[PDB]
């Protein structure tokens, strides 16, 4: 079987998988930003 | 069916002066330490949950790398978006320092309160 | 005249404040269930939903079952007291040689049984309120 | 002998004095708060059981729509 | 082809399956209405 | 002369009283067990009848 890099690249290469993963990373980064902003504002 | 407890019961107002104010479930006000402390606790759990979900992301794509199949097989790709948005939404505190998930459990607590009122009221009427 | 007339109140507050502990348990478990919602295992709408369901039903049901336990406890105290009344007079007969002082303190002794037993009869009844809810969770899950 | 406890036993007497009257097995009445608590308690539990039954009915129907069989597999017809 | 709507239509089309489910539905609904009846009677 | 002649009487009362609490436990358990009829889970014909 191929190395992990080729499967990983093929995983980004698909447009539908790519858009869902960037969208999910978007909510993840937004959520951690909420966490940071209110742990700061609370202190 | 369903039944909201009588306004005069001390169970709900004791809930009110303990937890403070819960949006849409109760209107009484008390010691407002709660709202803010579980607000910050929800924010901290949000941060560590983002970390843990990123961890699960690397491990899930790593298992997918062992399989070499596109679109993934360990997870359904049509339910991940909706699932993630619902969970993230259910983990936003409001200005009251409370998520909507805690909203549904306080709703369940007051509903169990109402069930207790129902049984106890039937008993007292029988006596 | 004192300890039993108030006892159901004491133990009822203990069970109710235990229910309060169940409430804080639930509302701190709530964000963890929310976090488990966003978990990427499977396709279920609940994820690690077993916790959600079991503590959910626990906190939802606790009040009504403490009520049923309370009322069944006033019910059980009466059967307990007439069992004790029916058994006591015959349980002492030959105990009441038994002459003189033997008749005297034995007389004493019977009350120190009767009421003391009484003290715990109703008392176990009220562990009954503390008994149904938790054991209830052992059949549903 | 057939399983029939004597008439003079107080076991059944206090049993029924605790649970009021029970149809066909017990004769006599006592403190009948017991009957009303089971009435309301059974009603509450049958309503709750009904909502769980419809919940499980939707679960079974979605499972059998996923599989394509009829009325599921574990559930019969 | 085959979908959830197709499955529901196929289950509804069968006479015996349809009739057994409508009897079970009737039993459950009558159960919940009598339940409501002695809730309101209890109160 | 005093404690032992009566003590088994007391222990038998606590035993029959545990029996009382257990039979109440049973009649509270009845609704769930006969509600379990609607579920065909398991090889048994009683649903969740264990």
Given a contact cutoff of 8 angstroms between Cβ atoms, the answer to whether C131 and C16 are in contact is no
Taking CA atoms, A34 is separated from B37, B65, F45, in Å, by 16, 31, 53
Distance from CA of B64 to the nearest CA of C (A): 13
For D31, nearest residue in chain C (alpha carbons): C75
Given CB atoms, is E43 within the 8 Å cutoff of chain B? yes
CB-count burial class (<10 Å; 0-12, 13-18, 19+) for F44 = exposed
Tokens representing residue C44 in the block: 């279920």
Residues B5 and B110: beta-carbon distance below 8 Å: yes
DSSP, residue by residue, C18-86: HHHHHHHHHHHHHHHHHHHHT--SSS-SSSSHHHHHHHHHHHHHHHHHHHHHHHHHHHHHHHHHHHHHH
Give the residue from D53, D8, D16 showing the smallest Cα distance to D34. Answer: D16
DSSP track, E3-30: -HHHHHHHHHHSHHHHHHHHHHHHHHHH
C-alpha C44: how far from chain center: 38
**Helix, strand or coil for residue D21?**
coil
Smallest CA–CA distance from B118 into chain E, residue: E43
B125, C46 contact by CB (below 8 A): no
Question: Is residue A2 classed as helix, strand or coil in its secondary structure?
Answer: coil
Residue F34's H or E segment, with its range, is helix F3-35
Q: For the stretch A4-38, what's the b/e string if a residue is b when 16 or more beta carbons lie within 10 angstroms of its beta carbon?
A: eeebeeebeeeeebeebbeebeebbeebbebbeeb
Query: In this complex, do C68 and D33 lie within 8 Å of one another by their Cβ atoms?
Result: no
Instruction: Report yes or no: B102 and B38 within 8 Å, Cβ to Cβ.
Output: yes
After which residues is chain C discontinuous, taking C to N > 2.5 Å?
96
Q: Inter-chain contact D64–E7, Cβ cutoff 8 Å? A: yes
Q: How far is C91 from chain F (nearest CA, A)?
A: 7
Please give the Cα distance from D56 to D59 (Å, whole number): 5
Instruction: Characterize D30-50 residue by residue with b for buried, 16 or more Cβ atoms within 10 angstroms of its Cβ, and e for exposed.
Output: beebbebbbebbebbbbbbbb
C-beta atoms surrounding C98 within 10 Å: 12
Structure tokens at B27: 């209107």
Cβ contact, residue pair D40, B115, below 8 Å: no
Closest chain B residue to E42, measured at CA:
B122
User: F28: which chain C residues are within 8 Å (Cβ-Cβ)?
Assistant: 68, 132, 136
In chain E, what residues touch D44 (CB-CB under 8 Å)?
Answer: 39
CA distance B83 to B78: 9
CA distance B127 to E29: 32
Query: Which chain C residues are closer than 8 Å to F13 by Cβ?
Result: 83-84, 87, 117, 121
- Determine how many CB atoms are found less than 10 A away from the CB of residue D6: 7
Tokens of B20: 């403070």
Distance CA B8, CA B11 (A): 9
CB B98 within 8 A of CB C34: no
Distances from the Cα of C7 to the Cα of C2, C55, C118, D22, angstroms? 9, 29, 12, 31
- Tell me the shortest Cα–Cα distance from E38 to chain D, in angstroms: 7
- The Cα-based distances of B115 to B103, B118, C71, D47 in angstroms read 18, 5, 15, 12
| Residues C110/F2, Cβ–Cβ less than 8 Å | no
Distance CA C119, CA C125 (A): 11
Cα–Cα–Cα angle for E32, E33, E39, rounded to 5 degrees: 90
Interface test with B, best of A5, A28, A39 (most B CBs within 10 A): A28
Query: Token digits for C137?
Result: 């969770």
Shortest CA gap F31–chain D (Å):
7
Q: How far is CA C94 from the centre of its chain?
A: 36
Please write down the HEC assignment for all residues of chain B. Answer: CCCCCCCCCHHHHHHHHHHCCCCCCCCCCCCCHHHHHHHHHHHHHHHHHHHHHHHHHHHHHHHHHHHCCCCCCCCCCCHHHHHHHHHHHHCCCCCCCCCCHHHHHHHHHHHHHHHHHHHHHHHHHHC
Inter-CA distances, B69 with A3, A8, A12, B60, D52, Å: 13, 10, 12, 13, 39
D18/C contact by beta carbon, under 8 A: yes
Contacts of C12 (CB under 8 A, 6+ apart): C66, C70, C126, C129
Distance CA B41, CA B18 (A): 17
Is the Cβ pair B1, E42 closer than 8 Å? no
Helix (H, G, I), strand (E, B) or coil at D68: coil
Residue D29, both tokens = 């009445």
Give the integer Cα–Cα distance in Å for B71 and B69. 7
Contact F6 C131 (CB under 8 A): no
Q: What are phi and psi of C18, to 5 degrees?
A: -60, -40
Q: What is the crossing angle of helices F3-35 and C101-127, to 10°?
A: 20
How was this structure obtained? cryo-EM
Partner residue opposite E35 with nearest CB, options D43, D65, D77: D43
Q: Which two tokens stand for residue B41?
A: 């606790």
The nearest alpha carbon in chain B to C62 belongs to B112
Burial of D24 (0-12, 13-18, 19+ CB in 10 A): exposed
Cα dist from D70 to D61, E3, E13, E23, F21, whole Å? 9, 14, 11, 17, 45
Structure tokens at A7: 């499967």
Chains C and D touch (3+ CB pairs under 8 A): yes
| E35 Cβ neighbours under 8 A, 6+ residues apart | D43, D46, D47, D50
Extract the tokens encoding D12: 């059944």
Q: How many CB pairs under 8 A join B and D?
A: 18
Resolution in A: 4.6
């Amino acid at each position: 079987m191929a190395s992990k890099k080729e499967n990983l690249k093929s995983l980004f290469s698909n447009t539908r998988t790519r858009v869902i993963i960037i969208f999910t990373a978007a909510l993840l980064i937004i959520a951690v930003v909420i966490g940071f902003f209110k742990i700061r504002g609370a202190t | 069916l369903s039944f909201a407890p009588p306004a005069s019961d001390l169970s709900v107002v004791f809930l009110g002066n303990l937890f403070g104010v819960v949006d849409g479930v109760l209107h009484g006000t008390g010691s407002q330490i709660m709202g803010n402390m579980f607000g910050v606790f929800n924010s901290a759990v949000l941060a560590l949950g983002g970390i843990i979900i990123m961890y699960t992301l690397m491990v899930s794509t790593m298992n997918t790398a062992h399989e070499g199949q596109m679109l993934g097989q360990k997870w359904s790709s049509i339910w991940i978006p909706l699932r993630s948005t619902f969970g993230l939404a259910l983990l936003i505190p409001k200005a009251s320092g409370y998520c909507m998930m805690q909203v549904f459990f306080m709703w369940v607590i007051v509903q169990g309160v109402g069930a207790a009122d129902k049984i106890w009221e039937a008993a007292l009427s029988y006596l | 005249a004192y300890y039993i007339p108030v006892l159901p109140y004491m133990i009822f507050t203990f069970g109710s404040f235990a229910w309060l502990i169940a409430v804080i348990e639930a509302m701190v478990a709530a964000p963890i269930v929310a976090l488990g919602v966003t978990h990427p295992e499977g396709n279920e709408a609940f994820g690690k939903g077993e916790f959600a369901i079991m503590i959910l039903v626990n906190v939802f049901l606790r009040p009504s079952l403490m009520i049923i336990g309370y009322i069944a406890a006033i019910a059980l105290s009466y059967v307990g007291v007439w069992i004790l009344n029916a058994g006591f007079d015959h349980a002492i007969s030959y105990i009441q040689g038994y002459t003189g002082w033997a008749g005297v303190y034995a007389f004493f002794f019977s009350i120190l049984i009767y009421t003391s037993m009484y003290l715990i009869i109703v008392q176990k009844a009220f562990t009954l309120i503390a008994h149904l809810p938790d054991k209830v969770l052992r059949w549903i899950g």
